């Protein structure tokens, strides 16, 4: 099966600033990745889909990119609001499977 | 307006079987893909499988043999359930919509806790 496999698995990072993650793929998943956050307590949201779409509503600072086993999502000069889990999940095939998340925390 | 609501039995003892209700209001059944994940409590999303608008299930090739997921088309509901529950099995059940490659509304989720 396809093991997605995410890093850094924790960040800590100011508001402001521009951070990348990555979701790397056992195999190949021909692009078929989405990216979710997920904040305290709340159900994921869908972020981005097909490795560079954006979903409706998400602010343009996010972006994705990615082929074959390597993806990832840039979120440019943080905002309190994208503190939280991101996840990233393909699409090739089934089943289907998650990365581990990386967990966006607020610098101190 | 699309919503998904899930509702299970809280907690309960290990080894029971158990079903969890996805009941789903704003589209049709037919029409949309449904999927089951959940989340260990502080742990990762974990992928348990889906049915199709046509009816075809599919199962995360782990979990498989202990996993069921039917549906009702009439009442709008997707069930998931789960023989022999097992104290690792306590987690946050998510039922979401799946449409062209993204689960695009997800349930708020609804917690089992398999304890004695």
């Known amino acids: 099966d396809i093991v997605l496999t995410q890093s850094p698995a924790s960040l800590s990072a100011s508001v402001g600033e521009t951070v990348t993650i990555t979701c790397r793929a056992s195999g190949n998943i021909h692009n078929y990745l989405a990216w979710y956050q997920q904040k305290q307590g709340k159900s994921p949201q869908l972020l981005v889909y097909?490795?560079?779409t954006l979903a409706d509503g998400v602010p343009s600072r996010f972006s994705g990119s990615g082929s074959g086993t390597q993806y990832s999502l840039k979120i440019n000069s943080l905002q309190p609001e994208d503190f939280g889990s991101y996840y990233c999940?393909?699409?090739?095939?089934?089943?289907?499977?998650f990365g581990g998340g990386t967990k966006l925390e607020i610098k101190r | 307006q699309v919503q998904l609501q899930e509702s299970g039995p809280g907690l309960v003892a290990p080894s029971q079987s158990l079903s969890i209700t996805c009941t789903v209001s704003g589209f049709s059944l037919t029409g949309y893909g449904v999927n089951w994940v959940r989340q260990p409590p502080g742990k990762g999303l974990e992928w348990l499988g889906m049915?199709?608008?046509?009816?075809?299930?599919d199962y995360n090739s782990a979990l498989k043999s202990r996993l069921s997921i039917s549906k009702d088309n009439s009442k709008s509901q997707v069930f998931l359930k789960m023989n022999s529950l097992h104290t690792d099995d306590t987690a946050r059940y998510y039922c979401?919509?799946?449409?062209?490659?993204?689960?695009?509304?997800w349930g708020q989720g609804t917690t089992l806790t398999v304890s004695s």
């Open positions: 999940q393909h699409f090739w095939s089934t089943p289907r499977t």
């Open positions: 979401a919509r799946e449409r062209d490659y993204r689960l695009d509304y």
């Open positions: 049915i199709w608008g046509d009816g075809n299930t």
């Open positions: 097909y490795t560079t």
